[PDB]
Design a binder for this molecule. Structure first.
Ligand SMILES: CC(=O)N[C@@H]1[C@@H](O)[C@@H](F)[C@@](OP(=O)(O)OC[C@H]2O[C@@H](n3ccc(N)nc3=O)[C@H](O)[C@@H]2O)(C(=O)O)O[C@H]1[C@H](O)[C@H](O)CO
Ligand SMILES: CC(=O)N[C@@H]1[C@@H](O)[C@@H](F)[C@@](OP(=O)(O)OC[C@H]2O[C@@H](n3ccc(N)nc3=O)[C@H](O)[C@@H]2O)(C(=O)O)O[C@H]1[C@H](O)[C@H](O)CO
Ligand SMILES: CC(=O)N[C@@H]1[C@@H](O)[C@@H](F)[C@@](OP(=O)(O)OC[C@H]2O[C@@H](n3ccc(N)nc3=O)[C@H](O)[C@@H]2O)(C(=O)O)O[C@H]1[C@H](O)[C@H](O)CO
Ligand SMILES: CC(=O)N[C@@H]1[C@@H](O)[C@@H](F)[C@@](OP(=O)(O)OC[C@H]2O[C@@H](n3ccc(N)nc3=O)[C@H](O)[C@@H]2O)(C(=O)O)O[C@H]1[C@H](O)[C@H](O)CO
Lengths: 243, 258, 237, 238
């Protein structure tokens, strides 16, 4: 169907070669994407992904971002795996009743049986965990996307200063090989096409560069924007304490 | 889908301009509606709503109201939200096995995804909660109703006032907050309900009306079109004016659900 | 639907006016039905009902009744209600995996919404309980039966071992009355000398004949499973 | 499907009469089948079956067998029965989320209502258990196979000995097999004319078939043990 740009928040996010920006695409963002100092991929997101550990606060924050007209998103995804050691069980069980307009990412991730098996085996037995950038690719493939453009994936710093007060108060495997091997498995297994939008990223050594279309893109500035996660009230945490 | 009169129990319930009373309509009542001293809206209810906290006792009381021919109702709704801080999990889980002829209001409330998201966000993060008067509007919409006539909704302007004396022995024993000068729940507000009502009307394209011209609600919702009709309020004598409390053995059997 | 005869194990079971016994019918029996000294209703059962409290042992016993050619039954029902104070929670939860060829009676009982509500309200709030005869009537109606003929309803070291201390007339009667008033079914009484005859219309005399086969070397007490078996099912008792 | 060869890992596994091998068949293997010193039935399995008790370790080991190309399998089955005294409950509950490409054998076993009831009654009340050979037969029948060829069924490694240093019997297994065959109208054949099984099951027809028994060199001959970190993650299911 339509193309999709999947963006991690690595430093390459600020080094996209926009001449290679595809025509007609959706955008997937994750975690502290809003910390970006400019709208490197626009204000419109098809989907935003948040880890279960901070979903409570990210959801709260997202609503503010939307009200402030800083961003808009069609879908709100929680990057879960249905694994007791990775996320809170009751959180997943009651998810749809606390966040009626959001989705459990596993609902889609699990549609890719071969990859789910691949991910689980390496995480359970070898402690290898893929990053959100790869999780988003899986969900995109599950949703039907055929051409995936990657950016902000640098296998580890960020494309912004993530050292924020509120975030620090909340959160004071991986490896390049795991992510790369996972991406190759996805591309091969589901016959989709991966492209790299960041020619200077280490990712460009493994994934084909997005074709040059002589495209152009206006990177809108951001001023007095939300650059830190918000913390809900004490009464709010009390009500959500069990999750 | 007939029209529907949704009634809270505020003092405006006793001041309905019956000249605006629609023709063919259903009636939704809630909580201590039977405390009314006159059948301000007739004996026949399409549905009655009860909060999870007192559902056990309200169900018991309802069966007595029906057996005693004081009221009749087609549906019995429990106003739940699938929120751990608002209701007992087991109660909801086993609901249909303990009350086979009743319904969990959430089964319908959740059909309105946007409103459920709206409600949950404000309740969880800002402690802003709609009242059952608004909850019933949502369930009516989910049921298919498109013309809602409101009454008995006064946003607790004069405090915890009602269209009757709610300070009854059993109710005070079961819900002690009623003994307070102002039993109104801090999370409720005139604005919250109004905005919630505005959200529903807009989002689901339904029409709202007000049967109480003298009510504070008349300042927000369009008054019902004076159809120049009559109703005739039936009087009530030696009626059930307090909630009933089940036996100790009954509570024992239900203990896991409370 | 074929006609169904629902039998309790009261003395009226031995006083059935066979002249009224229908032609093509199914038979529902419950609990210690096999204690009967004669096949008052034949060896063939459409279904047998057992209370959750002794299901473990009754199932074990039934398998012997079947293998030993004493009785046969198509269905095996456990008379549950999905009430924590009435049945073991884990027992109901895992029922179909421990007894693959049996059924939870509630799966059918719950199909009668009005009666389920009627039963639940009176039991929970007033401690009024129905007997198996009434429960079986409900299940029969839920299964699609149109005509129900009642009998055996008059309001062993092992059994005494399992049940040491081994309901009301009004409650059952009121329940049956509600059942007939609420659903599209006809109720008949096959025992004219039973008190039930004072409330339920007598089955029409059809000048029917029926040979009552005697029983010999039959199982007349419930069987008790091994301690190892009990060890495996202890969580459900 | 069509035809399937079900194999236990007894001595008869090494005494198959390949002249009687069907032409188009799938292979079902169980537990320590890889301990075989030769590929008596090929490297390709339609399905492999592991008991719940060691599934965690067997799954880990199978992935190595596959990665090292010693064997390949389409299906991975856990031989469960939905019985607390026979398997961990949380293990069964979360199974598909920990092993996305595997299957709970009971999802198929329970499709044979009569046999499920038959098995449960005798296991619960008479402590009679069936061996994997029989379990695989039931699953095979549930999957649609009509002709089942048995082998490696004879009624009778540091890692395995450390991990696992009853109620089985020829009678129970044989009676169970006969019940399955009669009840589900399928045909059972014995591929090992020198096994006691031959005394009960009709030998497979001689079709003058040929089979190449591939050798095994430097192969996995013991179960593998996951890391302590892995165990810590699966602890609740063991
Ligand atoms: C402290 C902590 O827990 N850090 C983790 C981090 O190790 C990583 F696990 C993950 O993501 P996180 O990287 O920060 O931000 C999103 C994605 O950007 C890509 N990236 C980023 C920086 C870099 N140098 N090279 C990269 O490739 C990865 O694809 C990653 O998934 C995650 O979800 O995968 O999330 C954070 C936080 O849990 C989260 O931000 C709080 O809401
Ligand atoms: C003490 C306590 O817990 N009070 C609460 C109250 O804060 C409110 F949460 C709620 O409402 P409740 O008073 O019965 O009254 C029913 C409805 O009438 C309307 N009304 C009433 C009086 C007034 N002055 N202005 C109004 O607008 C509201 O729309 C309300 O929903 C409720 O479910 O919304 O229920 C009671 C009880 O939990 C319940 O009666 C026990 O069965
Ligand atoms: C001690 C104890 O717990 N007794 C109860 C008894 O009060 C009754 F509740 C019930 O009934 P149960 O005796 O077996 O007899 C079966 C049915 O026959 C009818 N009948 C019997 C004898 C009589 N004189 N007048 C009658 O009307 C009733 O309709 C009853 O449902 C039951 O399931 O309804 O079961 C027994 C045992 O729990 C059970 O036998 C153990 O397996
Ligand atoms: C100690 C313990 O628990 N032993 C049991 C054993 O009683 C049997 F239940 C079973 O047997 P399993 O080894 O896999 O081997 C499969 C079948 O091969 C045949 N055979 C094997 C070796 C031999 N010397 N003579 C034979 O005849 C039998 O027909 C057996 O059923 C089973 O599931 O069928 O598994 C083992 C282990 O639980 C399992 O291997 C560990 O993962």
């Amino acid at each position: 169907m339509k193309k999709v740009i999947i963006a991690g928040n690595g430093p390459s996010l600020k080094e996209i070669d926009y001449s290679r920006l595809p025509n007609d695409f959706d955008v997937f963002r994750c975690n502290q994407f809003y910390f970006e100092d400019k709208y490197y991929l626009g204000k419109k997101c098809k989907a935003v992904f948040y880890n279960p550990s901070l979903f409570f606060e990210q959801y709260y924050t997202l609503k503010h971002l939307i009200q402030n007209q800083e961003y808009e998103t069609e879908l709100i995804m929680c990057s879960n795996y249905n694994q007791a050691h990775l996320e809170n069980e009751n959180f997943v069980k009651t998810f749809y009743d606390y966040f009626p307009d959001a989705h459990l990412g596993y609902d889609f991730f699990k549609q890719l049986k071969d990859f789910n098996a691949y991910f689980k085996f390496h995480e359970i037995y070898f402690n290898q965990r893929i990053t959100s950038g790869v999780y988003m690719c899986a969900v995109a493939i599950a949703l039907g996307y055929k051409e995936i453009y990657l950016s902000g994936i640098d296998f580890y710093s960020y494309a912004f200063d993530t050292k924020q007060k509120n975030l620090l108060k909340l959160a004071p495997g991986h490896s390049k090989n795991t992510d790369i091997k996972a991406l190759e498995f996805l591309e091969k297994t589901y016959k989709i096409k991966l492209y790299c939008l960041c020619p200077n990223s280490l990712l460009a050594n493994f994934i084909e560069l997005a074709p040059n279309l002589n495209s152009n893109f206006i990177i809108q500035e951001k001023n007095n924007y939300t650059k830190d996660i918000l913390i809900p009230s004490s009464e709010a945490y009390g009500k959500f304490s069990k999750n």
